[PDB]
Each structure stands twice: as C-alpha cells, then as structure tokens.
Amino acid sequence: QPNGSANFTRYDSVQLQLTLNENLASGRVQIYAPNFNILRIAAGMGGLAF
Amino acid sequence: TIKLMIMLFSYFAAYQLGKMQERPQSQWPKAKAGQNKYMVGDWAAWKPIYMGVLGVAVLLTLLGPGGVGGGMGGMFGGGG
Amino acid sequence: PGAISQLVSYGAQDVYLTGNPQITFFKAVYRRYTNFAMESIQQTFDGTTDF
Amino acid sequence: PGAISQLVSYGAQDVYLTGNPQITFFKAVYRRYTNFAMESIQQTFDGTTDF
Amino acid sequence: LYQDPVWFQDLSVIFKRPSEIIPTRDQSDSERINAMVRLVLYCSFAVALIRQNYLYAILGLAIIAIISLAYALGAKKTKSNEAYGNIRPYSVKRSKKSCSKSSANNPFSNATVGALLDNEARPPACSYDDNDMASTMRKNFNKGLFRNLDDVYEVENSQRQFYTMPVTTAAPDLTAFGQFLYGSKGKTCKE
C-alpha cells in the first residue's frame, strides 16, 4: 500500500550533498532509489506505464 | 363539488406532518479492503484525466488578459 | 524547500496516487468492540497427574 | 498433475474455503491517499539544555 | 461549525420535486412559502377543473404572484441568527445559519483585523464545502496572480500555506468547546 512518494519527475534539478568523513578510501557511492510505476496490461498486451 | 374538493386537499394538507428532502451536507464513499471491486478510476486511467484537465486550463490561457500566461510570449483577444 | 518542495512540484505521475483521495493516514480509525473481560481460572485434574 | 490436479479434485469440505468466493488474493487494489509529505524540523530549547 | 439540511425557495422548479406538501410545519420560511404555493396551485387548478371557466387558474396564478412578491419584497433584514456559545434564543425554527462569505480583501475570512473594522460581532466562516465557497475562495486567491501553466492541480503558487484558521470570530467560543468535551448530561445522578 503506497504510503507517500516524491515525484522526482517534477524536480528539474536534484543534488545530493555528502559531507564525507576524513578517513575514507577512494571508491564508489552507489545510490539506489526504488520508485513507482504502473504495469499496464490490456488485450494480451503488456508493458510498463510511466 | 367545489366545497368538497377543496376540503379534500385541506384534510390532506393538514395531515402530512413532516418534510422529506434531498440528502444534506456531503455524500460519502466506501473503501474495499483491497480485494474484489473495481477502483473508481483506472490507475493508468488517472493520468489521462490529469491530461484532460489540461485541455481546459490551456484553452483559458489562449486569452492572456483573461488569465494565466503560457510557455512563451503572450496572446490577445476579447469577446463581444 | 522541505516538504513544501515535495508537495508543490506536483506532476502527472502522481495523479493515480493522490488525486481524488480515498484515505487520510492521519485520521485514526478504530472500531468499538464487544464488552468483555478476561480471567485466569484454575481447573483441576481428574486422576493422578504423574508420569 | 500438479496444481491442476489440486484444482480438479474439488470436494465438499473445501466449499467453506472457495465456494461462492469474495476475494482473489491476486488482484491488488490500493487506496488513493491525500497528498502529504514529511519533513524533519529542528525545534529549540527554552532554557539551558544540560544536566 | 454548524450544519443544516437543504432547502430552497419557490423559484426554479423545486415546487414539483418534493411535491405534495401543502401547509407549513417545522419548515424554513422559504419552504413555508413553497408549501403555500403548492396549496394555492392545487386548490385553484382543482377548482378550475370542477368549474370549467378557465379563469380560476388565472386567479390562482395571480395570487401566487402576490404571495411570492410579498415574500420577496417584505423581508426584514434585521436578522442576527448567529449561533455561538450556550444560547441560541433568537429562533428555534428552521433557518439558514449566518456565514461570513469570503471577500476580496479577506479571501479566507480569517478575521485578522476585519472584525475590528465594521462587524464587531463577526459570524463564523462556515465550512469549506457548505455553499460552494471553495470556488469563490480559489477565484479570490487567483486574482491578479499569474500561473506558469505547469500545474493544473495548482500547488505551485503556494495554496497549501494559506488556509482558514480554526476560529474565525473575535472569541474562541470556549463554551461550545467545553460542551464538546464535557456534555451537560441533563439531569445527572447527583441531582
């Protein structure tokens, strides 16, 4: 059951600022963002709706 | 039959104590537990109504002085 | 800024989530229930309670 | 065979679970909710914040 | 906020939808006039049918016009039917509760300083959905303000921040609040 969402489709520009500790190795920050869509099925035909 | 017919209405006029009327305040909606009924609007369906609403909003904006700007410039006109 | 930015930047891809709302999460609803009370009552054994 | 056999071998004792049914577990339905968003906002202390 | 059922006056075509009411009881003044209209119409039409001279219906319509015109013109504006506090003694019959409708200077009827201006005693701004004042509120807010035409569920020009405050009168009406939390219970056990 949906309990709220951020519509990033209307966020013309988004940035995420990370203030890093002083003892980190060079490497990756992998950022994930689970989101919502609609599975759209009709008359035998599928596809995912935006 | 004048005296009688008027009295027939008079007798009935007295009697119907009470006043039936249309439901007041606000109408209400029931929510399925989430099985067995069709949503009010198809989820794919909901976005289109969004889109349908826009037709009206844009049409209003075809006359600048009558409302809110568009995506460029501006336009003039009037009625009669 | 804040929640306002999340609320105000309203698009199309959220119509099916918030248009014509059905549920307000902020309205607690509970149902009234049948009056009852519980008690622990000891029962006894008929016959020897042993191995 | 398999699930089909489990479906075909319909009896009497199972009517209480599937006869004249009300729900299908596999039809998701969700409610549209009032548009809301959450924000963490700092409040401050009136008076010293200490032991 | 106080709510009442729906009624209407003899204009339009209501005089047929809740038909077969003839004489007044526990009804609004508009409803009472409507009932008198029903009485006169049925009486005159029946009389015309009994004596086919085609003029008793004309006299019935004329007296309908007389009654409706009298009700329309002779209404006394000296009404202060405002409900608040513990007592509403002005009238006990059905009537429309007073509302402070939204205005150009005060789109949300928040009674910031309008109360001290002219009203002194300002009727509460009634519910958001009572008398289609939602459309009037939106129209008044969108007076002289331009939209970017990227929001057809307009939230971009900050509708949400603006709202009607819980109290719209000079006083919070604490008596009603207390009666809400603490019912009178009429005659109690200690009495």
TrEMBL record, chain B:
Top-level taxon in the UniProt lineage: Viruses
Keyword Transmembrane helix appears in the UniProt entry: yes
Keywords of the record: Membrane, Transmembrane, Transmembrane helix
Entry's transmembrane regions: 1-18, 49-68
Protein name, UniProt field: Uncharacterized protein
Species: Paramecium bursaria Chlorella virus 1
Source species taxonomy: Viruses, Varidnaviria, Bamfordvirae, Nucleocytoviricota, Megaviricetes
UniProtKB/TrEMBL annotation, chains C, D:
UniProt subcellular location: Virion
Entry protein name: Capsid protein
Organism, as annotated: Paramecium bursaria Chlorella virus 1
Gene of this entry: A622L
